[PDB]
């Protein structure tokens, strides 16, 4: 991609991604599965207090160079 954003976790990690403004949130998750091994449906991404929907894009949410997103995992118990 053509800019870099950061994904900070609740575990002291910081993931760095290269992405396009036109990358979908679902694309950003796929890049995280690639880099960290986490399935997309287990991820929730959060920016400026709002949770990001799979079908929208980084531009839809005004996410620019070197912005920080936040990753919170879902919990599924059996």
């Amino acid at each position: 991609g053509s800019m870099q954003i950061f994904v900070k976790t609740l575990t002291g990690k910081t993931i760095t991604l290269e992405v396009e403004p036109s990358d979908t949130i679902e694309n950003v998750k796929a890049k995280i599965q690639d880099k960290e091994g986490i399935p997309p449906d287990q991820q929730r991404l959060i920016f400026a207090g709002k949770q990001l929907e799979d079908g929208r894009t980084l531009s839809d949410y005004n996410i620019q160079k070197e912005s920080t997103l936040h990753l919170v995992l879902r919990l599924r118990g059996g």
Partner: protein, 185 residues
Amino acid sequence: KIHAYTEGGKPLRTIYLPKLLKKVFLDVVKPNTKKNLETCGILCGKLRQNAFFITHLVIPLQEATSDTCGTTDEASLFEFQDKHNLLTLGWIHTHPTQTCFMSSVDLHTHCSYQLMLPEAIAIVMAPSKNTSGIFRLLDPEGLQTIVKCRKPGLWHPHEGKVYTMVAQPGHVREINSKLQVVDLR
């Protein structure tokens, strides 16, 4: 004085678990366990001098049935942890009627926590059997198995030993410490 290692020889930092937490969790989710409903929560806390301290049990917004439970509004969970600088150190849930083990769903869920934090633990309460367990995936073989896994269906099986009970007291040590219980439901 005592160090625990993964199967592959990586050292695990110690997590201090309040002795109270298991008992208080069962108490907090007892309405659901009576109604034959699974419940879950998050183990949160802090890193002090190369050790983790569980300080908060957080009951997130969730939906449940008799054999499943899942979070629904992770944003409020996030807001709480971030606002209070809480690390995620693992999770806990009930088997209202089943035995004390990690199901296929538990393994896939936990794989992600243990990837984000090598020491992450999964506590399983089987109150109808009066047992409980604290588990993790084998590192690296079990992590690798579940990460690569693409099998469909909720309850599918896995090839080989995938998880194990955590080392006590080297990895997890139960101690008499303070606890906050945060109910976000």
